[PDB]
Amino acid sequence: SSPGKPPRLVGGPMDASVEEEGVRRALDFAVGEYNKASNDMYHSRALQVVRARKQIGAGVNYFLDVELGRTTCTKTQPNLDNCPFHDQPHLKRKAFCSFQIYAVPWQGTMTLSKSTCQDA
């Protein structure tokens, strides 16, 4: 994720925009931990985030929902804006995943609490 403004935080559970750096770090972390951490069998990426929210309190739970897909392009290939733009209508089966990262705010750490997914 790029650096940025302090993210909008409020209290309790709240959705944060994809423009949020507080979201973007969790977004990239999720794919990085899910897809990139797994062996590259078929190129797959969080194509499109459907929901991006977090719980604010003594425990911080990030909830990110994502459409996964086999990407028409690769990590090194050009046009990363357009390839996933075309991957949504290419999703004959719309694969949806839910990623939950529990951030332990007391230590400034976080850990993926859940990763669940569908096939595309």
Ranges of each domain in the chain: 1-120
Q: Determine the Cα–Cα distance for residues 8 and 91; give it in Å rounded to an integer.
A: 32
Report which of 93, 94, 90, 71 is spatially closest to residue 81, judged by C-alpha positions. Answer: 71
User: First vs last Cα of the chain: how many Å apart?
Assistant: 26
Write the CB contacts of 111 (distance below 8 Å, at least 6 apart in sequence).
101, 102, 104
If you search the block for the tokens 């089966």, which residue do you land on? 93
Q: In whole angstroms, what is the distance from residue 14 CA to residue 10 CA?
A: 7
Q: Which CATH number fits domain 1-120: 3.10.450.10, 1.25.40.10, 3.40.190.10, 3.30.420.10?
A: 3.10.450.10
Rounded CA gap, 56 and 11, in Å?
Answer: 5
Are 61 and 34 in contact, with CB atoms under 8 Å apart?
A: no
Residues in the chain: 120
Three-state DSSP at 105 gives helix
Token output for 101: 């990262």
